[model samples]
Target chain A: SDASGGIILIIAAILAMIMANSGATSGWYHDFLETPVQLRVGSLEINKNMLLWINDALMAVFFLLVGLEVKRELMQGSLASLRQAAFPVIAAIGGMIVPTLLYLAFNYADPITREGWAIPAATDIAFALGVLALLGSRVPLALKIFLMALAIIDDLGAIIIIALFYTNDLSMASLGVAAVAIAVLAVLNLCGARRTGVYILVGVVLWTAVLKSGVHATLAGVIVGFFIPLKEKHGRSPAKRLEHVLHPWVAYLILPLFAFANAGVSLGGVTLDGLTSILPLGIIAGMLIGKPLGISLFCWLALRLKLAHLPEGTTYQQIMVVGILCGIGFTMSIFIASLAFGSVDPELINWAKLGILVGSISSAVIGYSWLRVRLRPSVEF
Target chain B: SDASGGIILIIAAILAMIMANSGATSGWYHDFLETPVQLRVGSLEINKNMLLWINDALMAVFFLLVGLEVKRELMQGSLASLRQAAFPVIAAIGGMIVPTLLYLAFNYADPITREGWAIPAATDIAFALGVLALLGSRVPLALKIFLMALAIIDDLGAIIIIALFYTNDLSMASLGVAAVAIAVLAVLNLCGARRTGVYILVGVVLWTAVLKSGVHATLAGVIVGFFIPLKEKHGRSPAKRLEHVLHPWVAYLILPLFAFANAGVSLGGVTLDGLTSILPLGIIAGMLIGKPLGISLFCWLALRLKLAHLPEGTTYQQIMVVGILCGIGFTMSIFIASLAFGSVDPELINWAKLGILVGSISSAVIGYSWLRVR
Candidate 1:
């Protein structure tokens, strides 16, 4: 039902862009985002701008939702069976590697620009699923499942990359607090404590600690989500209940607010040649060219090697189009790009945004068109 | 069960008082407490010393637990019936009125000292229950119920006076945000939103907005606790469930921390005459003389007029002993005294503390001796 949330995500960015580009509204837009948020208890303090809160705090909730969904499905849904998971998992890995390789191919000489190789490596779950749903009943169930599972894996990979690369000075004391909180959370889970409030309380502690430690606070959300006791052995599934409650809030509110905060791209200096620059062109080639090339080669190899079979009713032609759809990386790619190039050169961030916008839209449109035709039993493109 | 909690609350007060008085720890204890804690977000900020955080913020959690229990009872427990509420309500009123009047009687000449009138009117349910429970199984269960119920009403009565009298100037915009948050919270309940997280999120907003304004932030805690969905109509009783989870935490953690923070009584100045200082003497008189006299007199009037009856297996002598126990107003009385006299005169606040500690213990010892004999 949270497919209902798909377009609201897009509209949020569109609205943001409108506000950012306008003379009358840009100041208010930037000022509102710059609002500072702080929390203190005893010697502890967390201070960040409003935009950072959206990205860190609000998005932590998003990661938590993703974590619950992924863990639950790994236990019983599409990702449960080893074979069921293999084909999509391989394709997602391929998708990640190829995009990075292509981005590196474009910006290898500039070490600074090369740092953003992971920018195009991940997929945006909402943006792709949003456009995929535009096909109505024509969209195949297996393709949808493949897209979602692949998106989940891609998110996990992005999560890893951010932790490994895009972090600042670590506060050991903060990490100590986070480590202790995690231990308590694990014990709470082990003790069969079914209270949600207890976990929520400790989860807040974990997030603040992780955030203060210079780790992406989003990871703490994932940590807590996976630790939420998923017990059907007794009665209700605590994990699923929390998921249902958090889903609409994360999808409609957090994601949209995220888009609104990050999607404010100024088109003032943007032109055809700007789009042709090294940074923009690298992202463009990675998404438009690299995604299909990487995923198809990997999936086809897996089939030939008998490592996996094609998804039900899906073919190389369809998988190729699915690969194209995987390149619609609006949210996640924009997120990674912000971490990579945002603080260095202000103009560089704008170019990175340009590349993502163009690359993602191109993949979305061409992928949608090709898939729509392929679903009707037309000739392979 | 929470008489278990009442046990350690005393230890915390003793710990604080020990640190407040002992040369080995007094300087560090007061120094650590004076440490400033600050919160900032956008244009709004809350800055207070560690002591203030305990009194203002942690006590908010205590009030939240009170609200939950009080509402639960009104829904199903002792306060459900108007007649049931009447005896304790009148006695509660008596306990409050007499204490204030007695305190005022001693300080009526001094305009500044008169502000401390409501100090002894407040009852520390934690302190009172802890002392009563020590009287062994011989203590009448009926007396426990009456003691607790009247103590609860007096605390509620104190909340009203704090709002009406002690509060500083009103901030319209701050209160405006609080009003909006309260509206959203109530609508969430009406909408059948079963998620605890949702209520908690909005409740935080309510707390912040209320704290930002001049009104007591603890009031927001009560508001939120009352509004927490009591959905026994479904899979769980949220009210009781949360109360079970929170009761221990508030009792063991928040209350102990509250006592540790606020119960520091320094005895630097020596003499019986210092104890006889008009400020200290008023509190002692108010708790020892005022509580028993007011409660017994009021109960006798209500019984003679036939408006209410005694609890099963209870008598007037026992009721008066319960009133003496009500005088064990350490936590709540100290709280009101801090708010009343803290900013005005440091000497006055210390005297208030000395009076509460000495006054409360005397009542505890005297009340138990009588209750045991009777």
Candidate 2:
């Protein structure tokens, strides 16, 4: 059992990653993605998408996890620091700016594709840190913290990019509709609509308007997420709201189910051409070459420039591996790929899918191996 | 606050029963009942019916209230002993059996019409108890327990009947599929699939198979309810699993919304013969007369036979009023009436709708007045 500690974590990572990458014949992935659930009140209704289903129903669970993590981090971690924040915080900005540059490097030729710079910047920490954590004694505690700080900032940057940049043509009419809906929602909120549902009701109509307003539909999630008043002072702890209300849904059901529906790209009559397409090459190169170059160079520059300082006793090798780990973009990379390739060529879309599978796997393996080889000055027994 | 204690409950009942009885319009009821949602997995798909949408998805809130009542009764009330249990358990049997007999009395000549027996037997206790509770000191505690217990048994009986009798042609194929699916679900349970969703994945398939097998789909809620093991066995317990899980859904969302949807029964025009027709007469008589007669008589027998004793210090006056209380069969009555008249006559169904409204109203007011006068 003790020996399997690293093995166990790696197993879970491999299970999810391999399940996602496997090329099954049937389009089970997309079909599973459209599982619809409806919430009805009299004549009012809310329909769910299989992917974002987690947002309404399952994110509640994820939020519960978020609450738990936040609680623990605040209680006993680097997040508790004022002066201690400089290391992770500085590294985070470096990590984010570098990945974007790397992705932009690949997409610089096409204006449309350049819009996807943040696509390769995402690091699925669950998988990355999870894999690192698996290597047991081989991985350093500093590396884990670096990844955590890197991910938090990476996620923040991605959120900002989605909100500010990745938008469609805006419609004034829908914006007005969204405005009115939000106003009504705000009034309901003011009137002690601490009831979660009134927000969902208003949120749906608001989302529809926002969707019509030519914003990325996922950005609607970001907007709605930010607007939810984070009242930690209520009788209902955020944990209660998440656990009692949402956990049973997102964990046991939605996410795994969504994975089943979205991951299986049909691998019938595949070719080498499918493996080397622009989207795949861009994603692979962006993650592998770009991530390390961008993150490491930017961190060194920030330190030299005195804009940020490095972590205490942390080596450049560890930072570079963190950069390489940032290359492991599974969730956001696949997500953006779905959106981008949804309306594009079927063959090339397969290549992008291949790239994601290969890129994520390569980054995870190499990153872990590199970190293991560059041992921290051995811990005193 | 004291006066309005029962106000929301009463208003909800009256609005529902009155709408069911009058010519509110078809659009109103149809719109409320039209919510359909689908979950697509691969090529396999599952969906929710309006009733299932309400019952499984919404009525969990209602069950939360039931859970609260169970908590209350167990803590300090009539459900505390055999002495208390006697009256309600016996009286509930009477309330249930007599109504079935009465429906049989009216419709025994026609087999098709006899299917409507369970319709009027349902007593909506929220409205009944809420009304009695509103009467304050005039209503006896023994009397309230008697009504609540009888309704509980009635609901249990209805669930049994829906499972056993009302189900149609058996699909051995689908039943086997469902059984296998349920077995797989059971394995997950053994493997510690504590998440409510692990059940839901198989549950959708179970429901579809059950639906195809000719058992009514709403029963899926109750069956699923039983399977969701209630594992709270400690102090100041974490919220009860299924109960906590369902509260937000049923209350602010499902029931009120369901009431809004199904309560819209429109009576566009009327004819004289239609007013005197057998369907309306059967339903009205079945509820108004049948409820009290069956309930009161059965309570008397329970006492005489000594199967169980009466509620403490309760008199025949309270019993009669309890019988009258049985008449407020708003939700379940309309639900059954819809099942009975499915695609028959729009007018006749409306008449049944009117029967439910009038019968439940007449029962409520009479029960209230009887309690008030006493």
Candidate 3:
């Protein structure tokens, strides 16, 4: 009961990793995930494997939960922090840019793999700070605040990337339905409706229709989520209500389940040829080199230009350590990798997943060590 | 904005009936209702037509809303009423039993039609009194109080019948899933879960599995509805929150659409042979002869026994009039009628539905006239 969701998530990913590589139980593990999960009201059917259910159906809930959090930040968490927030905004943008450039450069030789440029660009904010994070004990207060803003900006950027690039499974007809679903949602939002259920019933249509339309179905969760009013006029805050109910369920249940499903890259499935592949290296290089290099450079560049300054007591080394921590792209990095190569060869997905695993863990280890060493000098003094 | 859901419902029913019997678009009318509605994830499927979609799927929400109302009544509505509750409980029971007997008598020769006994036993609580019932202004306060309690008891009885009789389309596998669903719901309720969505997500499973299992799927709605907590200790009243959202929707939208789809008993589908059939006659007899006769008899008998009495300013004759009013079986009645004869011949369903239409209308008119005169 006391286990933090961050710890729980890593445990799930590790469980899947261990289970998928176990010689005896690996078949059962893979087959269990392969169990067909179906939901049908009538004739319209979504025929996908159980793993897709974990991603497409279950993960969509995670997206909506994040959507609510994002909307909360954009609506209430804005307006006050103009000059104050500008530093993290620039730094987070730099964070995403460097990773993508690294990925593009690596995938550039094989232009076919260029679509995977957004693979490492996503950072798993949950890992950087758990609600009860490992580094919560040691991190400087200002850096924690910086990371919160960075996470919001980082995720905001990723959703746009997801909405923009990872799409075109387009059935125009379902797209039209998804469009109408949006129109209905907006109308309901403005029409003095307070019930969350009404919005959700329509949102399901948005999710289902968008899924079929070829746009990442999770984007529907993001779209309708923004339509929820943060403050209700005469009654309970429906947006906050949804967030409260969704948060625990998403963090504890949905994220762990997603990690278990998506992070199930078999170690036995790995090969010398696969590990040396450009896909893994691109993700690895993007996280390890690009994230810290890009973020620290941007922070000082902004300060030098008098655009923004690092917060009080926060040093360049501190921001750089936090930047390395940002490279632990566990959830969304694997998500993007899946989007990139899910339908391709088995070896390809295995390689890409391996890259994500190696890169994300290295960032966490290296970030933890560097933060500890830097803090020790101050402690000893 | 002032229009009551009752009036809106009647209007929808009228529109569908008018549309269905209309010559130019009867084709379109039936076809639209027959439109293939499909929902699937992976391999499982529910491939019913649109009318069935309205009845089976959409109507399931109505059942859930009613289930929430019932739970509120059961959990909190008890312990206060002892002898006071006993009278109307008797009256409502009398109301269901007599109509059922009448139907059984009429369908006695055709034992196959005996299952239709419950068809006339249900009173559409919405029609009997809308959020704004027509007689609300005129009915004596005692009679109005009597009717409200009667409605709760009446619906409670019908749900039992539905859970009991109108089932057995049974797949034991889906039934097991439904059982698991119920367990999940009860656990969620007791587990300090306050969110309505978590309950509903599971409720949908209960509904879908129940639908496939061959149990009256709406009973699943009823079961889950009962599991929701009326009061949460540290937070929101998740039950009332659902009730508030579901009430307006069920009354204004789900009920109206139900009225539209189920009430579309085509006049053209009606034949002289069908009109004269036992199903319609039985329903007509059940409401007219059985309802007023049975209710007044039971009320006065209770007084005679000194067990309960009519309230001050309420007479035997007035209760009779209200009893007549109760006979106007519309929504649940039509629903029961469909269940009675739905899967049989096209002629059979139309005949049973025509019986519902005629019997319900006759009761409304007779009840209205008798109430006005008396």
* Highest-scoring model, TM-score: 3
lDDT of 1 by residue, A1-381 (tens): 536778898889899889888878888887787778887766677787776767887768888888898899888887788877788888888888988889898887897898888888878888878888887777778887888788888877777776877556668887788889999999999997876767877999988777742236878888889899897855887888889888788888888888888878877534656477888999999989988898899988878877765456566678888889889888888777766765576678778888899998888989988888777542456
Write down the DockQ of candidate 1: 0.47
Candidates' interface RMSDs, in order? 2.1, 5.5, 4.0
lDDT of 2 by residue, A64-160 (tens): 3444444434444665665556666666666666666666666678865665666677676556766776667766566677676676567646655
Which of the predicted structures, 1 or 2, would earn the higher TM-score when compared with the native? Answer: 1
Ranking by lDDT: 1, 3, 2
DockQ order of candidates, top first: 1, 3, 2
lDDT score at residue A125, model 1, on the 0-100 scale = 87
On a 0 to 100 scale, what is the lDDT of residue B9 in model 2? 42
By summed lDDT, the worst window of 10 consecutive residues in model 2 chain A runs over A55-64
Task: Choose 1 or 3, whichever is better by DockQ.
Answer: 1
The TM-scores of all predictions, comma-separated, are 0.86, 0.79, 0.89
Candidate 2 residue B44 Cα shift, in angstroms, is 7.3
CAPRI classification of candidate 1: acceptable
Kindly give the stretch of ten consecutive residues in candidate 1 chain B with the minimal lDDT sum. Answer: B207-216
| 10 residues in a row with least lDDT, candidate 1 chain A | A208-217
Model 2, DockQ value? 0.24
Which tens-of-lDDT digit does each residue in A1-381 have in candidate 3?
213878888898899888899889899887777766654534555665567656876657766777787677666753135666677788888998998898787777775577677777777766777532564445566666677567657765776776776455767878788889999998888885777777887989888787752236767777778887777675789888888878777778888888888788776854565565788888899889988988888878888878765555455677888888888888877776666666655466667788988998888888888777665333433
